[PDB]
Symmetry: C2
Subunit: 230 residues, 2 copies
C-alpha cells in the first residue's frame, strides 16, 4: 500500500514471481552485473499507486533513475536493450549490426514458442505442443548454422538469455510425459546440448527453478500470471 | 521471373507501392542519405525466387551486402534500426538510452493507430476511427511534454519518420468527410502543427502522396497490400 522510497544506487524490478518476462530481465541484470532489488508484485492484491503509474498493468517494470526523477520502463525487450546500451561493460548484443538484426528477428520468431507454452501451461499441458516443436526446429537449424556453443558465440549473449526463461520452463514437461519429452528432445540435438550448457551458467543458476518446481507451480497457477501483462 | 543481379554500391528495397511499412524504410534511407534502388513487388504476380527467400511474404525487404553474400533483412523496425546502427552519419535515434527506450515504446503504442487505420481503409473509411483518435491523444500529450517542434527535437528523428507514413495517409479522410476531419484535427493542435512541419521536410516530400491520391488508391485497393505481410 505504501510505495518504496526513491532509488539510490540500485535499479528496481517490479516482478511477479515465476513470470518469464521478469526472468528475462533478471538474467540480463545479472549478466551485466548491475545492482538491483526486486519488488514482488501480488497479481491479486495490487497497489493503487502501481496501477496509476502502469494502467495497462504491464510486467515486469524496471524503475530507473533519470535526470527528471525515477521512471518506469516497460516491455522486456526494450528494458533489456536499454540495459545493454546504458551500461557499456559486459555487452550482450553482437557488435555486428547484421548479426544483431538477426538476433532481433529470432527474438520475435520465439514469440510463437511463447504462445504455445502459454496455452500449454494453462490447459494441464494438453495443448499447443505443436507451436513449441515448430519453433524449436528453427532454433536448432539456426544454432547449427552458427556452429558455436551459444547463439552469442563462445559465451552466452543477448539472444541466449532472452530465450532461456521459456526453455527452462519446458523441462517441466518431463514430469508430465517423461518418454514423450525425451523423444521430442532428441529431435534437436544441438539445442538440447545448448540447454545443458545454459543450465551450468552461473547467471542462469542464480534465477533457476527445477522441472518439478515449475510443474507444481504451473499446475496450480496455470498461466494467469505468465503473460507480459496482468 | 528473373531475379536482379548481385548488389554493388546500392542497397535494395523490395517494396509494394503504397505500402506504409516500405514508406517507413524509404524515409529512413533518404534521411541517412544511403544509396538504394526499389524493386517493385506485384502482390498478385509474385516471383518464385522471392517466395523461396521469404516464405511468409513479409514486406518490405531490405537486401544488403554481407561478408557471406547478399542477405534479406525483414521487419521495418529491425530494418530501420539496422540502418541507424550500420551507418553512423545522420543518426536518427536519440543518443540517450532512456529517450530511445521511450521512442521504442511509442513506436509500439503507434501500432494501435495502424490497426484502426488498416480497418478503416479496408471498409470504405467507415470503421476504426476510435483507435486512431485514442492514439492521437497519447501522441499529442507526448509531443506537448517534449516541447520541441518534432519528437526528435529541433529536427525530425527516428520516431517522427517511423510514425509519418500512417499520419500522411490520414489526410485522405478530409476527402471522405471534410468537416468531421477538421474538427477531429483541432483536438490535437501540437500534433496538427507537427504534421504541417513534417509536410515541408525534404525527405517527406520525396516519398509523399496527396490526400486525393491516397483516397483514390485506398478506395480501389482497400488494405490488401497495406500490412507487414502479403
Amino acid at each position: 500500500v505504501i510505495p518504496p522510497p526513491a532509488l539510490t544506487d540500485k535499479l528496481r524490478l517490479y516482478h511477479v514471481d515465476m513470470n518469464p518476462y521478469g526472468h528475462r530481465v533478471l538474467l540480463v541484470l545479472e549478466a551485466k552485473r548491475i545492482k538491483y532489488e526486486v519488488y514482488r508484485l501480488d497479481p491479486l492484491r495490487l497497489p493503487e499507486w502501481f496501477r496509476a503509474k502502469n494502467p495497462r498493468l504491464k510486467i515486469p517494470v524496471l524503475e530507473i533513475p533519470t535526470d527528471q526523477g525515477d521512471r518506469f520502463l516497460f516491455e522486456s525487450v526494450v528494458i533489456c536493450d536499454y540495459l545493454d546500451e546504458k551500461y557499456t561493460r559486459h555487452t550482450l548484443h553482437s557488435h555486428d549490426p547484421y548479426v544483431k538484426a538477426q538476433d532481433r528477428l529470432l527474438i520475435e520468431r520465439f514469440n510463437e514458442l511463447i504462445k504455445g507454452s502459454l496455452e500449454c501451461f494453462d490447459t494441464n499441458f494438453a495443448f499447443g505442443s505443436e507451436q513449441i516443436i515448430q519453433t524449436l526446429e528453427i532454433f536448432e537449424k539456426e544454432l547449427t548454422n552458427r556452429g558455436t556453443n551459444y547463439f552469442g558465440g563462445n559465451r552466452p549473449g543477448m539472444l541466449d538469455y532472452m530465450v532461456w526463461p521459456w526453455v527452462e520452463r519446458l523441462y517441466l514437461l518431463r514430469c508430465v510425459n517423461d518418454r514423450k519429452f525425451v523423444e521430442k528432445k532428441s529431435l534437436f540435438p544441438n539445442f538440447a546440448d545448448w540447454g545443458d550448457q545454459m543450465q551450468l551458467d552461473d547467471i542462469v543458476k542464480k534465477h533457476a527453478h527445477s522441472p518439478q518446481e515449475y510443474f507444481d507451480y504451473y499446475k496450480n497457477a496455470r498461466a494467469h500470471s505468465m503473460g507480459y501483462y496482468l
